[PDB]
Scaffold this active site. Structure first.
Site, PDB file in Angstrom:
ATOM      1  N   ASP A  22     -51.342 -23.417  36.312  1.00 21.34           N
ATOM      2  CA  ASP A  22     -52.607 -22.192  37.098  1.00 21.34           C
ATOM      3  C   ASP A  22     -52.950 -21.414  36.047  1.00 21.34           C
ATOM      4  OD1 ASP A  22     -54.401 -21.048  38.725  1.00 21.34           O
ATOM      5  OD2 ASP A  22     -52.539 -20.625  40.154  1.00 21.34           O
ATOM      6  N   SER A  23     -54.230 -20.649  36.293  1.00 29.33           N
ATOM      7  CA  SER A  23     -54.569 -19.436  35.224  1.00 29.33           C
ATOM      8  C   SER A  23     -53.781 -18.258  36.251  1.00 29.33           C
ATOM      9  CB  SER A  23     -55.999 -19.366  35.352  1.00 29.33           C
ATOM     10  OG  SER A  23     -56.683 -19.320  36.497  1.00 29.33           O
TER      11      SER A  23
ATOM     12  N   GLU B 121     -61.758 -13.090  13.219  1.00 25.26           N
ATOM     13  CA  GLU B 121     -62.186 -12.108  14.059  1.00 25.26           C
ATOM     14  C   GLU B 121     -63.594 -11.725  14.018  1.00 25.26           C
ATOM     15  OE1 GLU B 121     -59.384 -11.860  12.550  1.00 25.26           O
ATOM     16  OE2 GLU B 121     -57.870 -12.046  14.366  1.00 25.26           O
TER      17      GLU B 121
ATOM     18  N   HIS C  74     -64.780  -8.393  38.451  1.00 28.60           N
ATOM     19  CA  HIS C  74     -63.775  -7.535  38.654  1.00 28.60           C
ATOM     20  C   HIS C  74     -62.878  -7.211  37.209  1.00 28.60           C
ATOM     21  CE1 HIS C  74     -60.751 -11.079  38.430  1.00 28.60           C
ATOM     22  NE2 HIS C  74     -60.054 -10.232  38.406  1.00 28.60           N
TER      23      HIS C  74
ATOM     24  N   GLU D 169     -60.703 -15.039  18.188  1.00 25.92           N
ATOM     25  CA  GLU D 169     -59.250 -14.639  18.106  1.00 25.92           C
ATOM     26  C   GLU D 169     -58.557 -15.782  18.423  1.00 25.92           C
ATOM     27  OE1 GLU D 169     -57.820 -12.151  17.867  1.00 25.92           O
ATOM     28  OE2 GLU D 169     -58.646 -10.205  18.445  1.00 25.92           O
TER      29      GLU D 169
ATOM     30  N   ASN E 210     -54.235 -15.289  17.829  1.00 24.93           N
ATOM     31  CA  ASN E 210     -53.420 -14.173  18.113  1.00 24.93           C
ATOM     32  C   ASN E 210     -53.898 -12.939  18.588  1.00 24.93           C
ATOM     33  OD1 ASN E 210     -51.314 -12.096  18.150  1.00 24.93           O
ATOM     34  ND2 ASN E 210     -49.854 -13.752  17.477  1.00 24.93           N
TER      35      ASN E 210
ATOM     36  N   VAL F  46     -52.565 -10.146  16.178  1.00 27.43           N
ATOM     37  CA  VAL F  46     -52.469 -10.173  14.738  1.00 27.43           C
ATOM     38  C   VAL F  46     -53.958 -10.351  14.137  1.00 27.43           C
ATOM     39  CG1 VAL F  46     -51.601 -11.193  12.573  1.00 27.43           C
ATOM     40  CG2 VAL F  46     -50.237 -11.128  14.552  1.00 27.43           C
TER      41      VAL F  46
ATOM     42  N   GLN G 144     -52.804 -13.360  35.912  1.00 29.20           N
ATOM     43  CA  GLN G 144     -53.404 -12.311  35.535  1.00 29.20           C
ATOM     44  C   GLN G 144     -53.589 -12.156  34.171  1.00 29.20           C
ATOM     45  OE1 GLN G 144     -51.355 -12.655  38.672  1.00 29.20           O
ATOM     46  NE2 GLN G 144     -53.080 -11.495  39.376  1.00 29.20           N
ATOM     47  N   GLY G 145     -54.708 -11.493  33.597  1.00 29.23           N
ATOM     48  CA  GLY G 145     -55.114 -11.538  32.172  1.00 29.23           C
ATOM     49  C   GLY G 145     -55.795 -12.668  31.777  1.00 29.23           C
TER      50      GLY G 145
ATOM     51  N   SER H 261     -58.400 -13.641  33.882  1.00 31.78           N
ATOM     52  CA  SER H 261     -59.463 -13.048  34.412  1.00 31.78           C
ATOM     53  C   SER H 261     -60.557 -13.163  33.725  1.00 31.78           C
ATOM     54  CB  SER H 261     -59.298 -11.976  35.356  1.00 31.78           C
ATOM     55  OG  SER H 261     -58.421 -12.150  36.485  1.00 31.78           O
ATOM     56  N   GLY H 262     -61.724 -13.407  34.118  1.00 35.22           N
ATOM     57  CA  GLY H 262     -63.056 -13.523  33.566  1.00 35.22           C
ATOM     58  C   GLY H 262     -63.212 -14.488  32.564  1.00 35.22           C
TER      59      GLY H 262
ATOM     60  N   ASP I  16     -68.036 -12.891  42.039  1.00 37.20           N
ATOM     61  CA  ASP I  16     -67.192 -12.498  40.833  1.00 37.20           C
ATOM     62  C   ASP I  16     -68.034 -12.790  39.540  1.00 37.20           C
ATOM     63  OD1 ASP I  16     -65.565 -10.757  39.898  1.00 37.20           O
ATOM     64  OD2 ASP I  16     -63.723 -12.283  40.257  1.00 37.20           O
TER      65      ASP I  16
END
Ligand SMILES: [Ca+2]
Length: 223
Positions: free
Chosen positions: A171-172, A62, A40, A52, A54, A57, A174-175, A177-178, A84
């Protein structure tokens, strides 16, 4: 992640951020060329960001590597979120080092009650909105199949498990995900769905990675 903690820079070295101009999902590096994420989270035009902390920044560790291919599971159903899972191939191999490292795929499925590490740059509020810049972490236990099914009647397949706290608060979200759910040092889950975040009686639902290892291996042997 709601109710979590600041992980510490590069202490979750397999966590990636998927960027399409902005962070939009997590993923997990499973070897120098391949990332596991949620189907999804599919977008065209993905850049994988490894190393990563931050995400706003450039701190110096990275690696930003474009995706060359994304492969949604052949049986993904976006209505139910069954299967999924997605693979993303990097255009070039990551340089693996202390801050950018792969996570092992599982041999066996994880056990109910196991405490797992869930991480991501998703919303930190149950009610409202606040997105962190630095990576957040949460330890959450796997719940029993029967508790998961009772929480989401008619919605849980054998390719999903629940993890978290039925009292709410952690909990986890939005954002996230994955991104990874790591249990005993193996990638056991992918942040997939849940009703709201950190609400009472509505734990997180995660893609059960151990059901996908043969697909993952055959797909990476062929692409
Ligand atoms: Ca950064």
């Amino acid at each position: 992640i709601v109710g979590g903690y600041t992980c510490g820079a590069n202490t979750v070295p397999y966590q990636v951020s998927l960027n399409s101009g902005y962070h939009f999902c997590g993923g997990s590096l499973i070897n120098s060329q391949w990332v596991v994420s949620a189907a999804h989270c599919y977008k065209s035009g993905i850049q994988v960001r490894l190393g990563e902390d931050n995400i706003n920044v450039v701190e110096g560790n990275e690696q930003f590597i474009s995706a060359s291919k994304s492969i949604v599971h052949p049986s993904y159903n976006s209505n139910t979120l069954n299967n999924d899972i997605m693979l993303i191939k990097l255009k070039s191999a990551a340089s693996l080092n202390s801050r950018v490292a792969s996570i092992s795929l599982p041999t066996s499925c994880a056990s109910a009650g196991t405490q797992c590490l869930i991480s991501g740059w998703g919303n930190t509020k149950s009610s409202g909105t606040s997105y962190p810049d630095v990576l957040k972490c949460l330890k959450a236990p796997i719940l029993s199949d029967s508790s998961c099914k009772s929480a989401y009647p008619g919605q849980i397949t054998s390719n999903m498990f629940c993890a978290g706290y039925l009292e709410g608060g952690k909990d986890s979200c939005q954002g996230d995900s994955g991104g990874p759910v790591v249990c005993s040092g193996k990638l056991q889950g992918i942040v997939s769905w849940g009703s709201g975040c950190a609400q009472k009686n509505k734990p997180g639902v995660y893609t059960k990675v151990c059901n996908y290892v043969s697909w993952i291996k055959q797909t990476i042997a062929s692409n």
